[PDB]
Symmetry: C5
């Protein structure tokens, strides 16, 4: 098989609307935000404008192929793949996707989708201009799939938090932590999972001694 | 049947442009706003910028399937389903849909579509900075289907007003009430139904 | 026939790009603006931001069906229908369509398309803060179809001008009048019709 | 033939991606801006916000039909037609197309596309508040078709009496320019808009 | 062959989702920004609003045709072509594409896509109002293709930095330089290439 064959097969047979549940177990989705920039902050309105890579990971066996004498990976338009219906609960704007909408697919069916996104959130901005900084909590989970269909988990807890964060922001990141939750909503009997990402950041210029 | 089969069947026989009217009974549509945030308020212009979940519920029997030894529910792109043509009469901006446009479909044909929406409205903002607060009235109904085709049912089950309302808003919700109306418009002989949602809120 | 059949038949044979002229006749289009709100006004720049229903009416016999034992009307996506290419000549922004893009089609081929639209216009704002008010003139007609192909006419429902107008606007409507014109443009030899809607309003 | 037939034929044999070249000659495109309004001007930033009709004209013989006892003209969605890939070089926003995207097609293959467009430009705004006014120069031409493929040629009437600005004069100039990317020359029309604040 | 035939053949066979890798070489992509305008600058927030032509070049042999007694080049909608998935890493707004989305394709398979783009970036604006000016660094590379699949190189080191730059901007360009990098990201074992374009500019008027 060559890349053309693999992509043909995927385009023809992937079922983008079909969640790749295996043996009635939930699709395990890993989610992780890599913060790139903090553009605007409003301590009056408690709103923040942020850029981050939404590193998203899951397995879809229907995409798999025999790679013994073939490419190990391909890039695939997400329009040709099932993607988790993740949403930020406290987002107050549509996700502005900054990057080409392609996912990386490995021959065993592992998928990595990691778009860079600019989005505004409603969260706690108080203390942003102090040493202690503010802690903006961002809640992400499947909008319509409950816990027997999608589970969400934070990816690896090890990584430079500012690895990709802009040195030119007026802000700096003090700490990023992630927490998993399972919540019942009044609309529905089922529990839905989410990841809460706590972004601890401050404005540059209040850790001064002199 | 597995999920792939069900979704295949729905996609193939989906008639998204066909209202699932049963024996010339109107399609009963339930509508409910769960307020998430109040972003901007202008007492001069009487305009508010709001985020809410638009919980929308109705039955479409053409979607139903035998779930004996099959999944009980699936998520479906609304592009594959008929959806009520609801509109907010006093909205002054296009609905900004914040969330993935999927509905939840139960095997008996019950549909739940509940997008998070940001939208601006023209309404009464006076008193927003008093302890009595302002009462912003939002009117939602079918744009083109009269009461013999769509009825809008304003009843809510188990929901507290601020249940999903952001603790970080400059505003707090005092009360949310819903009222059903049936209105005749000069263009047309038929009555069209709407739900009016009265949002009583104030600045913290 | 049921709704599914009717909508199927329409989708399969509508021909959205084909103006439904019968014999030697223009398609008669009725146009009428029902003002809902006046959001922003600038007396310096002579610009206004307005919300209105653009009530649009015409007949397309190719849509017609025998309604003997069948539904008398259906809602149809305008993407499946021929629609008049109307434009506001003095609009300075794209029409922001606020409502679901469906038209109402009667079994005899009569179509009613009435979206709510927000749009900015260049017009005379002088006097807006006086008792006499300002008179903003809005010009609407077919962009590409001359008078032998499309005729436009004011339809009046002599409803209240303020019938659907928001009580929460900072403005009030004093009067709305409509005038029909036939104009020749230097580009082309034929006359093109338009309706001029004169909105007389003032600041409260 | 009736309108339905003609539009059917055009839709079915529409090669919107195929430039209607005949005999190795360039498609002659006429362009002309009819200014409707000048909405915002910034003399500090040298930016103007303008509304104009972009009157665009060319011939496509593949659209032609025998109009013996048939309609002489039809309106056609531009999605069903080849359209010149014109762009304003000094535009700083996407063209906002205000009008229905239909072209008028005559039975001999002549096409007239004339949308009303709102767009912002970078140009010389200095002098706008003098009696001499400012002269904002707008440069339009095929983005990807050189002069052997597309030639461009020029062709207060419709200008709003309610604008804060008035037009003193409009002149058009044709140019042929070579760009460092490519060996061929690309043609453009430069429209000079002389206007002032009332 | 005439233009209609060529375009038909391309549309019918081009495979837009398939990277035209030849014999396990990466597709060599050249990228170069020709700056047209600098519209807004914010030295407090370190954000700039810029217009530039994103001159993008690569070879796709599957597009090739015999051009004996045929046209040597055609313009093709990019929707009918595979295009590199380039992105500016420090862009803070979606690319606003100002121009018709057509690429120029030569009969040997060489492609030139050069849209004019308006986009906002996060970069170093400090010094913009000095004689020395600011240097805004813009990082562009394949979002999902590593170095064995896409290599990126500056179209050239030899250029007039200001040939198409607007004389009506409030800013002037002092210098443009380009640097190639190969970076490993914590998500993945492979290296991804980028071009860093350093825009040295200042506000006019000393
Ligand atoms: C079903 C269909 N559409 C949306 C939801 N919800 C409530 C459960 C958790 N996700 C947010 C919206 C549930
Ligand atoms: C028919 C076609 N399009 C819109 C309407 N209306 C009048 C009925 C109530 N809904 C608002 C618009 C009616
Ligand atoms: C033909 C094709 N495109 C636009 C027009 N016009 C001129 C006739 C009056 N209508 C406005 C635009 C005519
Ligand atoms: C070829 C492909 N893409 C863009 C261009 N150019 C240079 C020729 C003149 N038009 C501007 C862009 C040429
Ligand atoms: C694979 C799939 N999606 C995103 C990436 N990345 C990391 C490699 C460098 N490019 C940015 C995003 C890689």
């Amino acid at each position: 098989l060559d890349r053309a064959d693999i992509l043909y097969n995927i385009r023809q047979t992937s079922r983008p609307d079909v969640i790749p549940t295996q043996r009635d177990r939930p699709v395990a989705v890993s989610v992780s935000l890599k913060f790139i920039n903090i553009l605007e902050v409003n301590e009056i309105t408690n709103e923040v404008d942020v850029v981050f890579w939404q590193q998203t990971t899951w397995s879809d066996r229907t995409l798999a192929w025999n790679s013994s004498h073939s490419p190990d990976q391909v890039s695939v338009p997400i329009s040709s793949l099932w993607v988790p219906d993740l949403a930020a609960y406290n987002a107050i704007s549509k996700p502005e996707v900054l990057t080409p909408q392609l996912a990386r697919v490995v021959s065993d069916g592992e998928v990595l989708y990691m778009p860079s996104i600019r989005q505004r959130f409603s969260c706690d901005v108080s203390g942003v201009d102090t040493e202690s900084g503010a802690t903006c909590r961002i809640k992400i989970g499947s909008w319509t799939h409950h816990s027997r269909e999608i589970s969400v988990d934070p990816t690896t807890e090890n990584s430079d938090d500012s690895e990709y964060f802009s040195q030119y922001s007026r802000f700096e990141i003090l700490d990023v932590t992630q927490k998993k939750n399972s919540v019942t909503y009044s609309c529905c009997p089922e529990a839905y999972e989410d990841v809460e990402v706590s972004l601890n950041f401050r404005k540059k210029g209040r850790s001064e001694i002199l």
